[PDB]
Symmetry: C4
Subunit: 325 residues, 4 copies
């Protein structure tokens, strides 16, 4: 048994990667989009709250400092000056809130007594506008543009290698839950092996192909109802020599690919799966999915992941039939 | 009289009965929720949500104001949020503050630390739901949905003589000037078969070689062109009689795939011909509008054909025998 | 003979009657915003929004005069502290829609309908602002549809190479950006009559440049020539030099390509007309070596010279016969 | 030794194109290109200066209309359209209030100035217009991903190997991050300068390397770094090369691995080559994807290294072809 070396659909990559050079640095150099991917709904709101609240507290503190520096402290008696109608540090609170949130309560109005105040408040306003633009841009970017949803495609696990049209074939079918059929639906079949070269060397992992009809052009299936993609057996095929004990006591991963174009959005969907050692039940044909009605046709998934029996099949190897000249 | 898997265009029968796995959120409350609520009721839902936000905030301010300074009225009363004597005062205060309106008729005074705390929280709330609503209304101008406008198939298809053999033919019609990039084309035959071992297979799909290996499938489409399918030994329509053609045992589905300019939408088109639109003989009337500098076409006669005087009926391998 | 059907070389096509299925339902916003393209839409929308301002000003003025004709001043104040009905209401609407809190007038508790009405106008104003800002964002962010940076050549360069006849065409890229998944095609347009004796005004034939062999996906950083070897499968296998000059066959080339950092599939069309032909010509070695540096220069791109010696109509005859 | 790729992507290292200006002039006529060229180095200052110059222009025009008509013409009587301002700073601050929609109640306008209301409604309109322009400009960079990533990478060291009774030009490709690719092409192109049959010096030209385009083994499903075979044959143009021929001569093997990043719309691809000596005769590759006892973990520490094969034939392809018979 192996039960690894595949994408995380069944089992998985099993503790991905190992200690190496890494080179996955400068995360915050371009974290504009990665953070929006990672932050998630859990604490984005509090991130914005804390960032922008500290943003106006810094400026409120500097207004408080300049108010202490100039104006009232020079002469508290009479002294027509700035910080009118407000006092202390609550003055800084209210001024910062009114100016940042563009609220016009009008209790405090700066004047010619503080010529630096106009420059200070205009710089504050432009910085606040920039920060608001950043916030709204981030919220827009996370909400609408990405679409992480691809589960409407499903690969039936149970599969069969058996008789068909006078020859042998191993088959697999796909299903969908809703409408909006795919466009340019490819299909592939790859087999995981371990080999030793003729010169002599241990190759740990090897990829070999299964001819599902790439050169015949029968791969672009128009999928509205489940269909069983098959593979005829021949001497060119790498599986012409397999027995029951051979298939049962040896492990090979038939990884499958159904990369497809979902409707509308330009997200290239792609699904992966494999059958490890025993999911292929020899001599177990498939059942009809017919749900015919007098008026038109529909179907439900009340018979998936099962099989009908066949008692009369050549219980032998693929080349055994070729032996019978 | 069969299933007719062809989708909405032309004949239409596609659906599913039982429900699998659906949920984890309204439907997305992310983007499909905005998709389904197009035009109707989305403005109503969000505007009622926002006005209920004002109602909640103003109710809280009214409660805190009546708790704080309403008890000692008619005796000085230098409490916070002055100029309040009823619910309407605090309600309109919330209206101004959340709409960042600076009327100034309202007041906040000092020594009311809870008031400023709630003011900053409600300001943040107003800002964040303003961002949410602007992002939501943005999505209306995000996905352009179209299934027409320089892409359509033909209501008429026919099998007829042509140089070499009989051929199934079909054209694709257009509306405007715009062209198509990577124009695929495919034909599939749906029928029923029985395995030699013996078992009922009502559903079987076979391919029609329109020249996938020969490379004649990417058509530069500016005027309608009749894609044709030759007849050979590999084809399943090698020799069938008139009873076969007027019988209903096969269905021809035709599929086109393209990408309109200045967009990333993989447009797909599907059409059907069961047993009746295909006719024996006949020929398409040419679009013969070759004139001076005035270059024109007209699809007024697009869906029509005429009849050949005399044509062979069977032929096939008659020369060898 | 002159019914050209391309776009970038010369000529075009037009449509008449065509059933008129391309009728706008005004349900499309992106196309409407694209069509104007910064010409007059800013003016259209600013006048739309200021007429909304005037509508609101008029309705506030009407309600004010409704209350104004009742109290007639010299009473317990009013809902709005103003005397000039039109100007005060207009400025009130302006400042409220712009969130300006000048506060020269008041609100009072005598007009709850005024509170309801200002709530509705604030909602309408925020929705309209969101709509306009979203439209501007959608139009500006979506690119201008450049569709350039790839250029074709002038005339067919039918000549000899490696002892065989061949047509060649080069491609220029003035910028530095490269292409991904660059296809290449070549279609010949002509007129044909079938063996049965019927007229086909327009017929397309393919000119393979490497399909089914893999040599069509060029990695384009230096201007490279694409050539078509002459074989039996080629249509113009052997024919006189005078007739091809008299002939009006049209060669159209397609260089579908993907430009970096986008999702738009570019495509280019060219014009090679048979009325002018340069038989037996060869281009210039654009590649120049600069010791430590390498370069090419497009000053001689649209130029070719003549080989002093070249076989004429070197067919199977006189080479095997 | 002319070429187009030295060791790595963007390895042109030459002069920019000259004598062409047909469609490379109107750089500023576009907005997206201007946003792409500019970065956060100076954008803050650009927006700041634009919007503050709008401020100054509006303040100046309000001050000019105040001089034209108002209270300063006849200082007596309170009949004026501003209850304040008789100074540049006050008018500027009023312009700031109007632009940033603060809402200070310190000043207002009188009904006898229809110009004033016309001016301020145009003021609000243009304020909204430039606010929308700024927010869209700042949005453009945040949402659309423009940074280039290098999750996939080639191998520095490549070898020519005597494997499976034939000869190959072995090379493998590594993936840094865990993410996978969709529709993974692979190509190999030889750059050379030749002379035609009649005797003309052909400039730089490209020839193809048959990695299995027709056999269909090019769409590799990449979760473990896998080598690429070539299976040198008589049809290949590398047959006549000998042991010293590769060293004395030179040739550029450009490799492209066009791929699709997960859940996006970018057709990423990478370019690399080997000049004349990076290819080592014989040699093999260590099991970089070494099996770990529990499950699969892979270390790339030994990625760019090779193991010296004890004994392999050292001759040309024609030599082995003739030695066979
Ligand atoms: K092929
Ligand atoms: Sr605002
Ligand atoms: Sr694409």
């Amino acid at each position: 048994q192996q039960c690894r070396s595949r994408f995380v659909k069944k089992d998985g990559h099993c503790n991905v990667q190992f200690i190496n050079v890494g080179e996955k640095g400068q995360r915050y150099l371009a974290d504009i989009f990665t953070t929006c991917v990672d932050i998630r709904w859990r604490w984005m709101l509090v991130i914005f709250c804390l960032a922008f609240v500290l943003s106006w507290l810094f400026f409120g503190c500097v207004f408080w400092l300049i108010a202490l520096l100039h104006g009232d402290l020079d002469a508290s008696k009479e002294g027509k000056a700035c910080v009118s109608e407000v006092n202390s540090f609550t003055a800084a609170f209210l001024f910062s809130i009114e100016t940042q949130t563009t609220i016009g309560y009008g209790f405090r109005c700066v004047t010619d007594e503080c010529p630096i105040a106009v420059f200070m408040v205009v710089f504050q306003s432009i910085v606040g506008c920039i920060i608001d633009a950043f916030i709204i841009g981030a919220v827009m970017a996370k909400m609408a543009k990405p679409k992480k949803r691809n589960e409407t495609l499903v690969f039936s696990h149970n599969a069969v290698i058996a008789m068909r049209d006078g020859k042998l074939c191993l088959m697999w079918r796909v299903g969908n839950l809703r409408k909006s059929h795919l466009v340019e639906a490819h299909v592939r079949a790859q087999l995981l092996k371990s080999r030793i070269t003729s010169e002599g060397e241990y190759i740990p992992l090897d990829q070999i192909d299964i001819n599902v009809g790439f050169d015949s052009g029968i791969d672009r299936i128009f999928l509205v109802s489940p269909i069983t993609i098959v593979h005829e057996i021949d001497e060119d095929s790498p599986l012409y020599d397999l027995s029951k004990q051979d298939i049962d006591n040896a492990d090979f991963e038939i990884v499958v690919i159904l990369e497809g174009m979902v409707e509308a959005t330009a997200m290239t969907t792609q699904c992966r799966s494999s059958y490890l050692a025993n999911e292929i039940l020899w001599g177990h044909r498939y059942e009809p999915v017919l749900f015919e009605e007098k008026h038109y046709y529909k179907v439900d998934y009340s018979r998936f992941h099962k099989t009908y029996e066949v008692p009369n099949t050549p219980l032998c190897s693929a080349r055994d039939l070729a032996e019978k000249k």
